[PDB]
Write a protein that binds this ligand. Structure first.
Ligand SMILES: CC(C)C[C@H](N)C(=O)O
Ligand SMILES: [Ca+2]
Ligand SMILES: [Ca+2]
Ligand SMILES: [Ca+2]
Length: 335
């Protein structure tokens, strides 16, 4: 009379309205009659953004015959190894936040994300920036697999747009040396900086330091920056609450009425994940969760609050889901 979806997320450490978006979707699914006549419930586990806790949660979900699918995890360094446990168990893992390209590069069959990867975000950013007249840019990046990853993706797409990367760097010691870098960048004709560092991983510090030194050029970053020195910052992300679409607007109004504040991109990704999984589960054999992955692929294009979703053979979401967001007066405007 009851079925369960597992959710693994750093619930306690983040004020990101993710739980609210999940809860709104579950309420909607139950109001419409549940899944195969059964009430839908969530089993929430907090991975504290820690790999060891994440792997333990993954095994606990995988060993529980009552879990039909899992939504999670948030951080790619947890989702990638946790996905091995879910994949070997034949249990769907659907991530609403992990953007590393590597997630879908391990031959897994049960592993999905319902948001664009870093590579798709980079591709759309390069297109936009070139149309805006960028020609010579600098990349500030984290010298790890994820930082090198997004940096190399952006450089490759920017090059195809006729943008030259005139310098890339991963460290500066103090503001004086950032001044010296900015002098070199001016001599190279710099017109913008792409920050391939996460906001919590040194990104925000650079933003503040850049303003101190007087760096004038546009700053561009990826999805961790969705979560007022930032005036004019361009962010490649997902979810447009101003999208003039019935589904997006029904969600925005419902979310506002229930929770008394605007939904975040994570509330939206969580909501679409629950709705997507419930639709696939309606049509599936609930006694065999290893059949659900094919059912998700069988949906083909599927309309959600984020836009149109579609899973490919590797589990990437190839829908046109990227939304470019620009900071104006402490608020994102939507391009
Ligand atoms: C929401 C982000 C901070 C998570 C990040 N996109 C990752 O893949 O790790
Ligand atoms: Ca199983
Ligand atoms: Ca050129
Ligand atoms: Ca350099």
């Amino acid at each position: 009379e009851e079925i369960f979806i597992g959710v693994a997320w750093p619930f306690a450490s983040l004020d990101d309205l993710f739980a609210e978006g999940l809860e709104l979707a579950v309420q909607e699914i139950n109001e419409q009659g549940g899944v195969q006549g059964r009430k839908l419930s969530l089993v929430k586990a907090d991975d504290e953004a820690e790999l060891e806790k994440g792997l333990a949660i993954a095994q606990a979900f995988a060993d529980n015959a009552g879990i039909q699918a899992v939504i999670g995890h948030r951080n790619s360094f947890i989702s990638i190894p946790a996905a091995s446990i879910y994949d070997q168990a034949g249990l769907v893992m659907l991530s609403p936040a992990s953007t590393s390209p590597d997630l879908t590069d391990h031959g897994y069959i049960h592993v999905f994300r319902n948001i664009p990867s870093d590579q798709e975000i980079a591709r759309q950013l390069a297109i936009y920036l070139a149309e805006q007249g960028h020609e010579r840019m600098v990349i500030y990046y984290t010298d790890d697999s994820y930082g090198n990853g997004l940096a190399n993706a952006f450089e490759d797409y920017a090059r195809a747009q006729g943008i030259t990367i005139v310098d890339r760097f991963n460290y500066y010691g103090n503001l004086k040396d950032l001044e010296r870098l900015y002098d070199k960048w001016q001599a190279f004709g710099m017109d913008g900086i792409f920050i391939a560092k996460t906001a919590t991983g040194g990104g925000t510090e650079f933003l503040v330091d850049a303003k101190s030194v007087g760096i004038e050029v546009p700053l561009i970053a990826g999805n961790s920056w969705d979560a007022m020195t930032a005036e004019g910052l361009l962010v490649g992300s997902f979810f447009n609450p101003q999208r003039p679409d019935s589904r997006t607007q029904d969600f925005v109004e419902a979310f506002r009425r229930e929770y008394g504040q605007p939904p975040t991109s994570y509330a939206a990704a969580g909501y679409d994940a629950v709705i997507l999984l419930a639709e696939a589960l309606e049509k599936s054999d609930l006694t065999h969760p290893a059949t659900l992955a094919q059912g998700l692929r069988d949906l083909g294009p599927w309309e959600g609050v984020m836009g149109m979703h579609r899973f490919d053979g590797r589990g990437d979401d190839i829908g046109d889901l990227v939304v470019l967001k620009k900071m104006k007066d402490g608020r994102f405007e939507y391009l």
